[PDB]
Design an enzyme around this catalytic site. Structure first.
Site, PDB file in Angstrom:
ATOM      1  N   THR A   1       0.861  -1.179   0.000  1.00  0.00           N
ATOM      2  CA  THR A   1       0.000   0.000   0.000  1.00  0.00           C
ATOM      3  C   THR A   1       0.891   1.221   0.000  1.00  0.00           C
ATOM      4  O   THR A   1       1.207   1.768  -1.064  1.00  0.00           O
ATOM      5  CB  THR A   1      -0.940   0.083   1.239  1.00  0.00           C
ATOM      6  OG1 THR A   1      -1.856  -1.022   1.231  1.00  0.00           O
ATOM      7  CG2 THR A   1      -1.745   1.366   1.186  1.00  0.00           C
TER       8      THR A   1
ATOM      9  N   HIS B   1       6.772  -8.342  -8.343  1.00  0.00           N
ATOM     10  CA  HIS B   1       7.559  -9.251  -7.435  1.00  0.00           C
ATOM     11  C   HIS B   1       8.801  -9.890  -8.064  1.00  0.00           C
ATOM     12  O   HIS B   1       9.747 -10.316  -7.375  1.00  0.00           O
ATOM     13  CB  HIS B   1       6.735 -10.458  -6.958  1.00  0.00           C
ATOM     14  CG  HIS B   1       5.498 -10.092  -6.204  1.00  0.00           C
ATOM     15  ND1 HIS B   1       4.608 -11.034  -5.733  1.00  0.00           N
ATOM     16  CD2 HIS B   1       5.014  -8.886  -5.825  1.00  0.00           C
ATOM     17  CE1 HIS B   1       3.624 -10.424  -5.095  1.00  0.00           C
ATOM     18  NE2 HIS B   1       3.848  -9.115  -5.138  1.00  0.00           N
TER      19      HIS B   1
ATOM     20  N   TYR C   1      13.130  -1.022   3.019  1.00  0.00           N
ATOM     21  CA  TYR C   1      11.842  -0.582   3.564  1.00  0.00           C
ATOM     22  C   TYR C   1      12.015  -0.050   4.980  1.00  0.00           C
ATOM     23  O   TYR C   1      11.185   0.729   5.469  1.00  0.00           O
ATOM     24  CB  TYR C   1      10.837  -1.730   3.578  1.00  0.00           C
ATOM     25  CG  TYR C   1       9.401  -1.259   3.715  1.00  0.00           C
ATOM     26  CD1 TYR C   1       8.733  -0.640   2.652  1.00  0.00           C
ATOM     27  CD2 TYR C   1       8.720  -1.405   4.912  1.00  0.00           C
ATOM     28  CE1 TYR C   1       7.403  -0.171   2.791  1.00  0.00           C
ATOM     29  CE2 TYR C   1       7.400  -0.942   5.065  1.00  0.00           C
ATOM     30  CZ  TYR C   1       6.745  -0.329   4.009  1.00  0.00           C
ATOM     31  OH  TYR C   1       5.439   0.092   4.192  1.00  0.00           O
TER      32      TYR C   1
END
Lengths: 284, 284
Positions: A74, A135, A216
């Site tokens: 998201t 991916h 991340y």
């Protein structure tokens, strides 16, 4: 003794042997995974990539976000998409902004599933430049994407983080200690993990005008910092500080640390360090 | 003194007056809403519908799910989509099923946002029959959808439920008692609510082979019941009981009752009963 039967039977009347000839594993977690161009794919992900490559036509204007299987995307989808569209859809347009009208997973297409369940989908009908996110691992990109000038944004999460992802399914749909053995071995949904990370790493260091590597964890720690750095990898001018703050501000409305035990972490920790030893990529 | 500026400037170089000529409200909740074909739309939703009508080409094979603005549609999107695809993507395909590979809001397109932020998108490139779901009210459907033979699934939620939806935004992005006055008046994002319900009601009673009316509350209470009834509205044969159970079972992985006070509920309750008095539609 036959791969499962998934959709568009038509395009499978002449393509169904390639699939049925790759190595496969087993257990109970996943059904029949296959090794394609170096990696093991669930049957679903594989049928997609397979045309996702035969058909995708990149545009130097594109922008591919690369992430790992099952970890939330998201915020990574809402974030950038908001960054590019700061004038097309002003970050101040609040309720009128695409993020307050359309789910982030429709705005930033996962080719794989697009080509999997809708093989005829026409990406050339979406607006350019294009934002989407996948991916796949490096060595399986659509010929143009490779021989084109778009821009790659690889978003890496610690394996122990990516691991829990694949594990989740095994929780929803051989304890956790077993699944780790498979993950660390590499014959596991998405692995051998130390390559679904190291080529976009060395890919970034080698051709920094096409591939960017963002962890991340840093994307979270210093969101405004990393974003300033992302926008400077695929843009052409200056970006104010308050620009980045207005974007993250808008996107604010969008682990293992509690799932693994010290031993299994160290176990993956032992393989991280090893696989990543010398490569420059160090995990926190 | 000018509507906001949102995307595709091109198609707005000759279309920008219609918008700037409709009635508009104000307050602080929303910026500049406009009344189009009887309803007030946020500027975003309106620019979409506006082409969403000029371009959409229905197919008797389609299936439109109609829902209210901002209320979750996941389960409603995951549910049916799973029902149609029980053979294309067997409900037993678990991890390979489109719902375990692609976010439900990419699989079941919200025309509005598709046409809003991607006006050139080619729906004719998606697979038929098609599944998608929208917010519009009856009297604004694409000419074919109206003069076609697809199938309408209207999913109604109690207003006090739909109300909280619009309210949320006013919480994220004049207390709640004020917003209720507007809702009950009808000059509010999506209203006058008693029509974003009653024509699909009388629409269902009048032409039951094209429009079906399902209350979201019953969809929840007896999920297996309503699903058996939905699949019989747009199909051609028999559906086992265990078929429906296998579908909901798969989709299991996917209010006001605590937000409004007795007076504001009764207030909306007073308008429900009134607006719905005699129509046959009674709210629990």
């Amino acid at each position: 003794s036959v791969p499962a039967y998934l959709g568009d039977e038509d395009l499978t009347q002449e393509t169904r042997a390639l699939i049925s000839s790759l190595p496969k594993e087993k257990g109970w977690l996943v059904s029949e995974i296959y090794e394609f161009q170096g990696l093991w794919h669930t049957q679903a992900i594989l049928q997609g990539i397979l045309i996702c490559q035969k058909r995708f036509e990149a545009k130097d204007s594109d922008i591919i976000l690369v992430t790992n299987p099952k970890s939330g995307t998201t915020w990574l989808k809402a974030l950038v998409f908001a960054l590019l569209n700061r004038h097309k859809f002003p970050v101040s347009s609040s309720g009128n902004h695409p993020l307050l009208v359309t789910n982030p997973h429709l705005l930033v297409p996962f080719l794989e599933g697009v080509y999997y369940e809708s093989p005829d989908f026409d990406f050339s009908s979406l607006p350019s430049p294009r934002l989407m996110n996948t991916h796949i691992s490096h060595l399986s990109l659509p010929e143009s994407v490779k021989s084109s000038s778009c821009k790659i944004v690889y978003c890496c999460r610690n394996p122990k983080d990516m691991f829990v992802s694949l594990w989740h399914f095994g929780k929803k749909l051989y304890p956790i200690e077993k699944a780790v053995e498979a993950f660390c071995e590499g014959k596991f949904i998405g692995g051998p993990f130390w390559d679904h990370i190291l080529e976009y790493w060395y890919a970034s260091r080698e051709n920094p005008n096409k591939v960017l590597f963002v962890t991340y964890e840093e994307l979270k720690k210093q969101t405004e910092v990393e974003m300033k750095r992302i926008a400077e990898f695929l843009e052409c001018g200056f970006i104010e500080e308050e620009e980045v703050r207005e974007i993250v501000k808008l996107c604010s409305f969008e682990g293992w640390r509690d799932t693994l035990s010290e031993s299994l972490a160290e176990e993956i920790d032992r393989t991280i360090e090893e696989k990543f030893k010398g490569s420059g990529l160090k995990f926190s």
